Amino acid sequence: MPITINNFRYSDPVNNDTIIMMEPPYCKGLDIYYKAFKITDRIWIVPERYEFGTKPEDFNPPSSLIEGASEYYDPNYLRTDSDKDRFLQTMVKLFNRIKNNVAGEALLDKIINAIPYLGNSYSLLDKFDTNSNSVSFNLLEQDPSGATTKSAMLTNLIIFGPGPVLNKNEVRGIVLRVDNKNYFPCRDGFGSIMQMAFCPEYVPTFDNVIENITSLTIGKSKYFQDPALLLMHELIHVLHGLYGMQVSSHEIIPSKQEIYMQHTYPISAEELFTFGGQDANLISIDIKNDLYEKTLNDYKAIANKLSQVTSCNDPNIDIDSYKQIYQQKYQFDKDSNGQYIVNEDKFQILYNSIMYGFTEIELGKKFNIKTALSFFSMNHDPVKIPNLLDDTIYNDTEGFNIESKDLKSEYKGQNMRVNTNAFRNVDGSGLVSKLIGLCKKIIPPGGELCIKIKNEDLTFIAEKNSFSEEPFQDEIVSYNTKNKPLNFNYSLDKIIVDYNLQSKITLPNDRTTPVTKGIPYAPEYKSNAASTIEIHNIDDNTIYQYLYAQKSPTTLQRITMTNSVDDALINSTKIYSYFPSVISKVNQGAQGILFLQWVRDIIDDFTNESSQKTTIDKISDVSTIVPYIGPALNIVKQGYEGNFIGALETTGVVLLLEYIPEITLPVIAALSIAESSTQKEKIIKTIDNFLEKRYEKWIEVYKLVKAKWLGTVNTQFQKRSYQMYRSLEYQVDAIKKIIDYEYKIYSGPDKEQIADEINNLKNKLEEKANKAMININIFMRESSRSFLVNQMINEAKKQLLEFDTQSKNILMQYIKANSKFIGITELKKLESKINKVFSTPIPFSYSKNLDCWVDNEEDIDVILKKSTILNLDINNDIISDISGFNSSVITYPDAQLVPGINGKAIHLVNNESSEVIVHKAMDIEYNDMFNNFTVSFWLRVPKVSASHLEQYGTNEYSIISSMKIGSGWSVSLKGNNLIWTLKDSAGEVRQITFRDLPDKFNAYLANKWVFITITNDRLSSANLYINGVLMGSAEITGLGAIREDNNITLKLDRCNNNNQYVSIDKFRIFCKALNPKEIEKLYTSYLSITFLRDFWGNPLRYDTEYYLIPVASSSKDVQLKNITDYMYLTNAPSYTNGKLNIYYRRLYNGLKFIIKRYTPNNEIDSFVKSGDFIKLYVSYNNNEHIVGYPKDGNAFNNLDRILRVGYNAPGIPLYKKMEAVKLRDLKTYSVQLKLYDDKNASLGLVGTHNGQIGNDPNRDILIASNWYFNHLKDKILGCDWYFVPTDEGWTND
């Protein structure tokens, strides 16, 4: 099953197998050859520049660009044999990187097996034709004689070095010249040789600014991209091309009229599907049906075409071999006559796998590589990665993000501020960008002031012509018209599951007859070179002057801040600012006495000013408004100067846009019926088809508006955040340059003492600028949402309501015409359901679908998924919402991460910095107010000591709360009592108080991971569950509206004990009250079997001391009789406390055991996986002694074998090979242990047998026996063990 990646040096000799002299497709018949290397089955590498259709002068750096982002040019790259070996070795390493993750392994398998069709639309119908440069390349071989032989070879991919532009990779199918037109076999189902132009050293950079998630220690920074993910991105284009599904229509063209509009190439639908995520919805659902149908016809043509084949130009080609291979590729079936036919069910699964399965984003997650969030996310200058072949910089299992160097966490290996060894800045000579000029008329104190703006800083505004209007035209319902799908998507996880099951299919030999037919026509290189700049002339100051005014000079000079934008543009020493408080304190030349106070007062003013939030009652679905956006960017209405909040009350969120798009829609034509010939059966079907196509209009039109929003509205709100981030950074850079000047002027005694606290206050500026961006991103995210949900979607609804009433006339006149046929009973019943349907509008969804019912009981996993509105997961030390609604999450400096039930968990200590905040998305803002809901999470709290129950036993502290004013819900603790509280608008209160059990070894709030679930039914009661079992209940009826805080806060609040902590994992909210059967499935979903677990519920680890306790006899510890002798059970001591109502068996007595790997490899993991072979040691007198059974040693009933600690009799072998497993009892944190001999025979599971050895007393002695294997379904069993390590959260009293 594993795919083989070949190794070679460029200097290795030609062998006519893995190393050849290739004549590439666009050189066919010219007898020009290049050394080529077979990286794997059907993939070649040619270390040469992609020079096809070019001239030498195209490779030099031009003066400017016509379109797009920055481009790096270097004609000397990949010239020498040395350069070529370097290129070859880097590619091999990147292919090995891809192979070593199963996601990437599945991608490579699809590409290899998706062989092109031996033929195309203009080839012979009865024949397979290998005589085309679309499918085959020639190659020159030698004999021992020295004479040569022209053969040919079939292939899927050929990888070349980069063309002129080094940082823009390309994938292209071979083009054929037919009737003086370009024909692409990679576009109508057949496929072809795909040619890639690739360069691994030069990569794009992106940043962190817009992201919903935010850490305050990470902050905002730039990142560079992993070459392996860039390679995989292009391999997705190769995959589409090979199945012949390359999309080349319905492009998104940028408008380029105004200054603010970005100049790019048209964005293909190909690119958007490959990148994935939300921006694949720029293509509206109707266009996806067009593309699906196109490919369905193309494949049907091939199924017909393949059937006619009885010959081939190559005599050696076995015709029947290829037929079964193409049947497999295309998922064709056979009719009983013997012809190939398209099964449409099997087609839909194949089509979605290719177009919507592999995407950059989804691969990024599987590989732990950081990606951009949107396609329109800002690119910066590319960087160079000149040490990919150093394993200390980039390895073939983690890339840059290596765990042993602490660079996996928070994707720090890609972070340009942290990992400064891994990159170098690109040389200035070869880098070129599109700049536009902007000149303004100014009065002398020559004629003008001109600035240059970068194309990357401009905004993308989509053309109106780029979006469909097919949902507005006439649509004819009939009997035989079909249902269209409204979901085009496919799971990468499913693709992996499919890849793991599918049986191997060997391909035929890829050597074939020579290529003589055709003429090579290489497409000419479309140059992006330019000689001049576009200059714009506007007399008013735009946003671009307002940002340029905030720039500081690069010189160690005194600076001042002003509120006059025209002054700051002229004077080099002056800077624009929009914080009045900050402007005063910095401009006054600092005080000689109390200099530290002056610097301290700068920070207080910057904090007060930059942190300002507000709301507007008339804009009810925007939680956060930042007032200073107007003064900073010059977004202002006339007669509202210095009053941005009034300007927003009057105009609405549309004030923030730089281009107002037309939101009015044409009339949606009513549904028409063409069904004259009618039986009674065919009428009822035509009524059902009429209702379905009516439903499909609402969804089609909704998704059309969303597409338009994404390309024309959302892109404008996105840039405003970058413009604010740039602005806030300009202000921080200035204030620091003021302090740097005034520090060097300052003359006092303690200058050297306070030095580091001055640098400590300069750091606090960037902290408060990042906290400001949290509000600004919430403002732009929710404004952009409000314009979609309200303004734009109301236009769709207006036309859709009119579409309903017009189509109801047409439906009930068709009913009138054929009303007679079973009237009395069905005509009345059929009319009743129609009036129910058409009266109800269909709701618009901005994110996931609010479905909190789900067809009575469809399926418990589906019910749980569908009803989820919040779900916190922790990936690579980042906490985020994965539910679908994508609520913003804020992680504060001292929120800590610890081992969890399946990954890592949140850990909260008792100070104000230890905090996690979820700002609820607007879609789920008020779902708690009147409706049912459920909250679930794993909890772990330490055993409260006898002292702290006396001190802090009456202190109630909350740990999770939505409460303001004070209304909401909260989870709180008080001594050993768990408390759920529910409080409404009018001050009504309902609580559940759960008294924990006195036996702390069996208690829920005594240092163990336990699963909490709290349901809330408004028409009855709220129920508290722990591990799926009901523990408490309280009545919720007679309770009004609940009006929460917009943030759900995870924090220790009003807790007096400064040493208190808790741990919370998998925090989740559902929009309904779960029943016990739904809870049980939720509880057990988290209990995996991959990793074993300790007594506390955390992952069991190697090289860690553990005390053993048998589950069946939990009041017993393990003791040694003597070294080299047996182990046995003893009564463990205990602690009782009458007045405080607590007691427990004392921990940490008995033998210390240690687990080690039986066959140590070079792993980073210290986690014990189920099935791992292990060696068990006892740690006695700080020495390690092996546990095992000696050959023919003492044993009860000849079958229960007595274990021996550190046995070493000279001759006799000791069997010590053990296997750690989890065979039973999934809810308990126990593990079993199987013993083996030298020949791999089971000596049994480890447990105990009652008896006697010598004249010792009667003891439960430790043994190994196969007896247990016939008893694994018993409720209690003697082979289950707790592994108990010492923990901060349990000390004996």
Ligand SMILES: CC(=O)N[C@H]1[C@H](O[C@@H]2[C@H](O[C@]3(C(=O)O)C[C@H](O)[C@@H](NC(C)=O)[C@H]([C@H](O)[C@H](O)CO)O3)[C@@H](O)[C@H](O[C@H]3[C@H](O)[C@@H](O)[C@H](O)O[C@@H]3CO)O[C@@H]2CO)O[C@H](CO)[C@H](O)[C@@H]1O[C@@H]1O[C@H](CO)[C@H](O)[C@H](O)[C@H]1O
């Ligand atoms: C109760 C007991 O002594 N169990 C130990 C067992 O002893 C054997 C006989 O018990 C069974 C059993 O219950 O497992 C009886 C079944 O009918 C047998 N089933 C079959 C053949 O299909 C099994 C089976 O033979 C074995 O498991 C082999 O794999 O054994 C037990 O009744 C018998 O006792 C008397 C007998 O009553 C009488 O004729 C006369 O007095 O002689 C016998 C011995 O005094 O003895 C059988 C063998 O000695 O043997 C197994 C061997 O692995 C265990 O030792 C088992 O004790 C369990 O051991 C566990 C871990 O080692 C753990 O300590 C449990 O708590 C013990 O019950």
Ligand SMILES: [Zn+2]
């Ligand atoms: Zn692409």
